Amino acid sequence: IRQRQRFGRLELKRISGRGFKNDEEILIGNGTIQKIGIWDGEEEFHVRCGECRGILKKSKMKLEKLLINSAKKEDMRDLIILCMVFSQDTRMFQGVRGEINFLNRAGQLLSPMYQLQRYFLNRSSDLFDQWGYEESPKASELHGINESMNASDYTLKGVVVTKN
Ligand SMILES: Nc1nc2c(ncn2[C@@H]2O[C@H](COP(=O)(O)OP(=O)(O)O)[C@@H](O)[C@H]2O)c(=O)[nH]1
Numbered sequence: 001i002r003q004r005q006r007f008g009r010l011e012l013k014r015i016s017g018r019g020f021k022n023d024e025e026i027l028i029g030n031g032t033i034q035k036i037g038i039w040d041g042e043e044e045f046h047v048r049c050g051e052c053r054g055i056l057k058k059s060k061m062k063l064e065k066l067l068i069n070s071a072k073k074e075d076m077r078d079l080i081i082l083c084m085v086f087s088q089d090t091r092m093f094q095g096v097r098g099e100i101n102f103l104n105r106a107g108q109l110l111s112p113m114y115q116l117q118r119y120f121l122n123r124s125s126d127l128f129d130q131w132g133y134e135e136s137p138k139a140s141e142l143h144g145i146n147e148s149m150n151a152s153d154y155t156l157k158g159v160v161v162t163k164n
Pocket residue numbers: 006007019036037039043086110111112113114
């Protein structure tokens with residue numbers, strides 16, 4: 001619950017909940033099936049990438065909500081991609097269109113989750129293209145954001161941003 005931890009470029013600190021991890025055979029969007037440890041349970045985290053911070057709520061293979069501050073657009077984009085991956089959202093696994101390696105050249109074992117993080121920080125349009133949008137909030141303290149990190153009347157599903 002109280003410790004700052006890292007998932008690569010993502011920093012997290014648990015707020016609530018508990019996940020339990022089980023290996024599952026996951027179909028990724030390029031057709032491969034890869035065994036991945038999948039977390040089950042409601043969890044909520046403070047999160048950070050750079051100057052952008054947020055609160056992430058996830059359930060099994062689902063980003064439920066991500067509420068972030070306004071920041072440098074590169075950090076907003078990276079926090080959102082990292083939370084989409086850390087969430088293990090079904091849509092994120094479906095977004096792998098291209099080649100992805102789970103062994104290195106010397107045959108050593110690589111972590112699927114970390115390889116997915118590397119994949120999407122390099123290719124985020126694969127994740128955004130099919131993520132989905134929903135109407136932004138109206139008349140509130142929050143606004144919606146599109147995949148270009150601009151305020152918009154429709155927002156990436158589950159994501160909202162605190163008005164300055
Ligand atoms: N949802 C959730 N993810 C976690 C937790 N602890 C570690 N992780 C993530 O779980 C994944 C673990 O991947 P990996 O290190 O490859 O370990 P493996 O599943 O044992 O092969 C990483 O994406 C970690 O950030 C947790 O308590 N909850």
